[PDB]
Amino acid sequence: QTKIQKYAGTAMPYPNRTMTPFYINHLGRHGARFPTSRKALDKVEKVLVSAQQENGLTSEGMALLSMIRRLSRLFDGQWGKLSKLGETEQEGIAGRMIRNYPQLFSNSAKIEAIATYVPRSINSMDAFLSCMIRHNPALQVQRSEGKQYNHILRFFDLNKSYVNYKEKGDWLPIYKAFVHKKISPVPIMKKFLLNPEQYLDKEAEEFVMALFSVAAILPDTSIPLNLEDLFTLDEWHRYWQTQNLRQYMSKSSAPVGKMLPVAIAWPLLSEFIRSAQEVISGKSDYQANFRFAHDETVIPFVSLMGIEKTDVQVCRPDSVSVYWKDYEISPMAANVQWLFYRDRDQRIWVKILLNEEAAALPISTACFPYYSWEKTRIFFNQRIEMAKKTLSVFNE
């Protein structure tokens, strides 16, 4: 909620969140995790060590180097793992769900959960399920995971055109230019390094961007250390703008991506509709389907749903941060829940929660936040059709 927390972007910890539905349809990112790569930590260390050898550190830089060496030991063998904070985030999400809708999960209700093959997502599922079971051990629970779910949870790895775009598409030079524009490395490096102006701009920006990366992830690790004060608030604001743009262009509805990053999510939207239709019809008798995956899953899924603002197509890179904010969409433990209700005339209504807050769709309803399922399904089906059309052009 603080400005500083928000500027961690997709690395922001899940925010504070302190009738009765007949079905809940869920997608959740894993909870708060350790950094996935040592790359940024190694860069910062190499720069500071080289400086130490040539007598190039300030007192603050020597202290920073000491801290970086410490984090290197603490991160060792922990890369990419769910942290204790990440487990508690899932416990909180499950706990509020059970507390809000006890009748749904009462008696011998049936639930199913799936996860990707990635350990932090499986462990997030388990933190969530363990909370459900503790509250009602009489639940019937199906738990599965792995590469069999790649088509719906890891579609971003399976589409060749998208993989090419993500790795070398036209968004890259836009992002790099924006970084050069927003981030001035010299004043930051002045804190840690003697003669910071002697550094070339490329190496200077790589160092600063790496240091921001280390600082941004630290609150997700449950390690009792903090580096927010390495940078001023304006510096964090600028860094956030650059990473926000990176996420928007590489994973969401940026014009430069031509909706390719969004279109690839259609199989998951299809599966969401299918699981709901089966419960409504009686073919399935689950009270909930839970799914645990990644920000690479959640971001395009939310845009494809067309939750208001998340699918905006903004042409000016400088304007993106005004209209589209990654920390509002995909913080750590980011989740989408569709809650289904039957009224006293047996009409079916759906409420959409994004990070446990009611979300709007660009269709009408006389009882917001509840939408007609019939209207909603028709709208989502049109989104899927649009997605298939988009992909028909980028087959490569």
Side-chain angles (χ1 to χ4, degrees), residues 219-261:
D220 292 315
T221 64
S222 294
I223 296 171
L225 300 166
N226 188 275
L227 295 174
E228 77 188 333
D229 292 322
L230 291 181
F231 310 98
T232 71
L233 179 66
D234 184 70
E235 285 165 355
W236 275 107
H237 192 180
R238 289 166 175 274
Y239 175 72
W240 171 74
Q241 290 167 334
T242 72
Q243 300 308 288
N244 189 64
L245 185 70
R246 185 188 209 165
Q247 303 287 353
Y248 177 62
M249 298 192 301
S250 69
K251 300 176 192 165
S252 189
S253 49
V256 64
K258 304 291 173 51
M259 299 297 288
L260 173 60

Side-chain angles (χ1 to χ4, degrees), residues 130-147:
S130 290
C131 184
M132 288 278 286
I133 296 169
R134 281 194 296 275
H135 279 102
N136 185 9
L139 290 172
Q140 324 285 35
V141 183
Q142 176 164 22
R143 170 197 186 276
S144 64
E145 63 292 309
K147 59 179 179 64

Side-chain angles (χ1 to χ4, degrees), residues 201-214:
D201 212 76
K202 181 179 178 57
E203 65 179 335
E205 197 144 58
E206 295 177 356
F207 171 76
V208 164
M209 296 297 280
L211 188 65
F212 272 119
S213 181
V214 174

Side-chain angles (χ1 to χ4, degrees), residues 144-174:
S144 64
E145 63 292 309
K147 59 179 179 64
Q148 72 196 110
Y149 300 120
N150 280 352
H151 292 276
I152 57 172
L153 300 185
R154 294 191 64 87
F155 42 76
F156 48 83
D157 277 353
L158 294 185
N159 183 283
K160 198 222 318 103
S161 289
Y162 174 74
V163 169
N164 284 333
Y165 173 76
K166 189 193 175 196
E167 291 178 355
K168 54 192 178 180
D170 291 342
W171 70 273
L172 269 320
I174 299 178

